[PDB]
Amino acid sequence: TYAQTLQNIPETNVTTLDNGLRVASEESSQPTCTVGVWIGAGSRYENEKNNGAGYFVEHLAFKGTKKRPCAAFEKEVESMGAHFNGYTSREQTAFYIKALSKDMPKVVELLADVVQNCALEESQIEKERGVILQELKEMDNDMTNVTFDYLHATAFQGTALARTVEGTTENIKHLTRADLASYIDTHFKAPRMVLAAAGGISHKELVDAARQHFSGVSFTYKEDAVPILPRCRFTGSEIRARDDALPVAHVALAVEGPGWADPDNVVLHVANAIIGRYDRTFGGGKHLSSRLAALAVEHKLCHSFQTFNTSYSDTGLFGFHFVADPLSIDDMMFCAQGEWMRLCTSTTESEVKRAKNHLRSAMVAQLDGTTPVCETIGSHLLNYGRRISLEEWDSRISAVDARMVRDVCSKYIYDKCPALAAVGPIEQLLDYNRIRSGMYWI
Amino acid sequence: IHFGNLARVRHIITYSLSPFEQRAIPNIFSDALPNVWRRFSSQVFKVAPPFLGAYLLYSWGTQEFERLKRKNPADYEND
């Protein structure tokens, strides 16, 4: 039974090193694995002058360390068949590796060598600088991310969160060997890091290899304390980047989210599970269960749309995004806001029951392989401070009912001034005022 | 159907805030009034003139009319 298969999922071991770093992992009977360090750093932690460093760093994290330069480092990893990947968001950075369990320790070594001893070769920087600069131009043509950036840019205008993860053009043109060095030395620290791993690994063999390469100890009490960030203020507002030269328009709308810790996030997710998502290649077409998707199809309202619940430590963004043609923006938006209102005022048990199953299947698929599991462990600790097992998630999801979905959505959506970002040939979509009024009365 | 076929517009970004995050009548003394005055000045010498020039003509014609109703003693000095 489903119920049992859940209980029988091995536990996630978590032990803390005397230096503050936390080592966690889930052992399976798998010959291959994924281990990595998930860090509590990112553009949010940056400032006006170093915005982008964490990214510039990401660009050098692999170009070799001091103990073993570029050529060697690369050669040593490729030759063992391991995959080295990593990323960086607004409140989270991470470098992880995919290799056979047999090399779990040599991997751990490599990791520690990357986060602790990045080369930062003066000559490499000036090159990755030209590289990042082009990545920006390529990303500038990805309306979907140009939109979410703007969404943040205004939803959290004037604050830390209103900054792009990649950073300013100036910032990247002038950042220095120093600033980068500083960022790493200021942010990459044991208490704010998590060595997570999953596969055919022994927690012990892991934790042991951990104490060995992650030995650096702290003296003062400050070094053991994780700094709390000044919070970000939400603002009902809009930003409209118009360009009738673009073929389609992109729209994103959202209200402020509750933040990782809050339980409501579960219901909020159950909610988005109802509205769900669409994209012209869904074969369900007109029979799809999602009311918005249907209208989208019956009336050719858009090319795609997605609901999201982007969470952060102390805040979040709960809204939706859609791509449409210049002349179907309004109906689309109109219908969309309609569903949000429907959530608040007339959700059905039938709706939620489904939304739940869709959500359950979702959480389970989020752990499909070793990298994804490791990514979940690396995150739960960093955000929830522990691990929430499918067995738990399920119970929290199973407890959600209509009456509940209604109250929450009402609590976060009804009559709230939303943040909106539009890009492209957005002439037909108009007036904040109008959009603001779509925030009440089903 | 008029919203969507209006104009070919490119590269203009605008920013605005919800009516609830801002003040209805803001900066009354720092911005409002100074401009009320500004506007008033720019026009006075265009409007006021002909209106004043009207008043006069009105006053004259009125007083002159009343004057022509009064008697001129120079019609009865003789007899």
Q: Is A138 a catalytic residue?
A: no
Which pairs with CB-CB distance under 8 Å and at least 24 residues apart come from A210-213? A210/A17, A210/A21, A210/A23, A210/A108, A211/A17, A212/A109, A213/A108, A213/A109, A213/A111, A213/A112, A213/A113
CATH of B1-79, picked from 3.10.20.30, 1.10.10.10, 3.40.190.10, 1.20.5.210, is 1.20.5.210
B10 in contact with chain A, both atoms CB, cutoff 8 A: yes
**Angle, alpha carbons A398-A278-A301 (nearest 5°):** 130
**With contacts defined as CB-CB under 8 Å, which chain B residues touch A241?**
13
Whats the size of chain A, residue-wise? 442
In whole angstroms, give the CA distance from residue A6 to residue A1. 9
Nearest to A276 by CA among A297, A300, A304: A304
**With contacts defined as CB-CB under 8 Å, which chain B residues touch A154?**
15
Residue A425: what residue type?
P
In whole angstroms, give the CA distance from residue A39 to residue A94. 6
* Domain map (residue ranges) of chain B: 1-79
Q: In this complex, do A154 and B10 lie within 8 Å of one another by their Cβ atoms?
A: no
**Mutual orientation of helices A177-187 and A122-139 as an angle, nearest 10°?**
80
Do the Cβ atoms of A23 and A58 come closer than 8 Å? no
Which residue out of A58, A238, A339, A375 is catalytically annotated? A58
Tokens of B78: 């003789």
**With contacts defined as CB-CB under 8 Å, which chain A residues touch B15?**
154, 237-239
* b/e burial code for range A78-93 (CB count within 10 A of at least 16 → b): eeeebebebebebbbb
Q: In this complex, do B14 and A239 lie within 8 Å of one another by their Cβ atoms?
A: yes
Count CA within 13 A, CB hemisphere, residue A115: 29
* b/e burial code for range A392-404 (CB count within 10 A of at least 16 → b): ebbeebeebeeeb
Q: Across the beta sheet with A193-199, what order do the strands follow?
A: A13-16, A22-27, A193-199, A32-39, A93-100, A83-88
Residue A11: what residue type?
E
Q: At what resolution in Å was this solved?
A: 3.2
In whole angstroms, give the CA distance from residue A329 to residue A299. 12
Question: Which residues, in sequence order, are bridge partners of residue A240?
Answer: A422, B14
Task: Say if strands A193-199 and A32-39 run parallel, antiparallel, or are unpaired.
Answer: antiparallel
Q: In this complex, do A427 and B9 lie within 8 Å of one another by their Cβ atoms?
A: yes
Tokens of A210: 């951990």
Q: Residue by residue, what is the 3-state secondary structure of chain B? A: CCCCCCCCCEEEEEEEECCCCCCCCCCHHHHHHHHHHHHHHHHHHHHHHHHHHHHHHHHHHHHHHHHCCCCCHHHCCCC
Question: Which residues, in sequence order, are bridge partners of residue A99?
Answer: A33
**With contacts defined as CB-CB under 8 Å, which chain A residues touch B12?**
242
**Mutual orientation of helices A264-275 and A402-412 as an angle, nearest 10°?**
100
Query: Among all residues of chain B, which has the CA nearest to that of A327?
Result: B4
Give the number of A-B residue pairs with CB atoms closer than 8 Å. 54
In whole angstroms, give the CA distance from residue A116 to residue A61. 10
Q: Residue by residue, what is the 3-state secondary structure of chain A? A: CHHHHHHCCCCCEEEECCCCCEEEEEECCCCEEEEEEEECCCHHHCCCCCCCHHHHHHCCCCCEECCCEHHHHHHHHHCCCCEEEEEECCCCEEEEEEEEHHHHHHHHHHHHHHHHCECCCHHHHHHHHHHHHHHHHHHCCCHHHHHHHHHHHHHCCCCHHHCCCCCCHHHHHHCCHHHHHHHHHHHCCHHHEEEEEEECCCHHHHHHHHHHHCCCCCCCCHHHCCCCCCCCCCCCEEEEEEECCCCCEEEEEEEECCCCCCCHHHHHHHHHHHHCEEECCCCCHHHCCCHHHHHHHHCCCCCEEEEEEEECCCCEEEEEEEEECCCCHHHHHHHHHHHHHHHHHHCCHHHHHHHHHHHHHHHHHCCCCHHHHHHHHHHHHHHHCCCCCHHHHHHHHHCCCHHHHHHHHHHHCCCCCCEEEEEECCCCCCCHHHHHHCCCCC
What is the torsion angle, in degrees rounded to the nearest 10, for the CA atoms of residue A330, residue A331, residue A334 and residue A336?
Answer: -110
In whole angstroms, give the CA distance from residue A233 to residue A267. 23
Residue A354: what residue type?
R
Nearest to A253 by CA among A442, A435, A441, A411: A435
Among B5, B17, B20, pick the best mutation site for testing chain A contact (most A Cβ within 10 A). Answer: B17
* Sign of torsion over alpha carbons A206, A209, A212, A216: negative
Do the Cβ atoms of A126 and A16 come closer than 8 Å? no
In whole angstroms, give the CA distance from residue A442 to residue A335. 11
What residues contact B74, with CB distance under 8 A and at least 6 apart?
Answer: none
Question: Which residues, in sequence order, are bridge partners of residue A35?
Answer: A97, A197
Tokens of A207: 């934790």
In whole angstroms, give the CA distance from residue A127 to residue A70. 14
**Angle, alpha carbons A382-A383-A386 (nearest 5°):** 75
Residue B6 C-alpha, separation from nearest chain A C-alpha, in angstroms: 8
Which residue do the tokens 């509590």 mark?
Answer: A40
Do the Cβ atoms of A249 and A261 come closer than 8 Å? no
Q: In this complex, do A330 and B3 lie within 8 Å of one another by their Cβ atoms?
A: yes
Count CB neighbours of B77 within 10 A.
7
Which residue do the tokens 């959506």 mark?
Answer: A413
- Residues 98-157, chain A, touching B (beta carbon < 8 A): 154
Q: Across the beta sheet with A304-311, what order do the strands follow?
A: A277-279, A304-311, A316-324, A249-256, A419-424, A237-243, B10-17
Tokens of A176: 């220095």
Which domains, ranges and CATH numbers included, belong to chain A?
Answer: 12-225 (3.30.830.10), 237-440 (3.30.830.10)
Q: In this complex, do B13 and A428 lie within 8 Å of one another by their Cβ atoms?
A: no
* Sign of torsion over alpha carbons A341, A345, A346, A351: positive
Residue B20 C-alpha, separation from nearest chain A C-alpha, in angstroms: 7
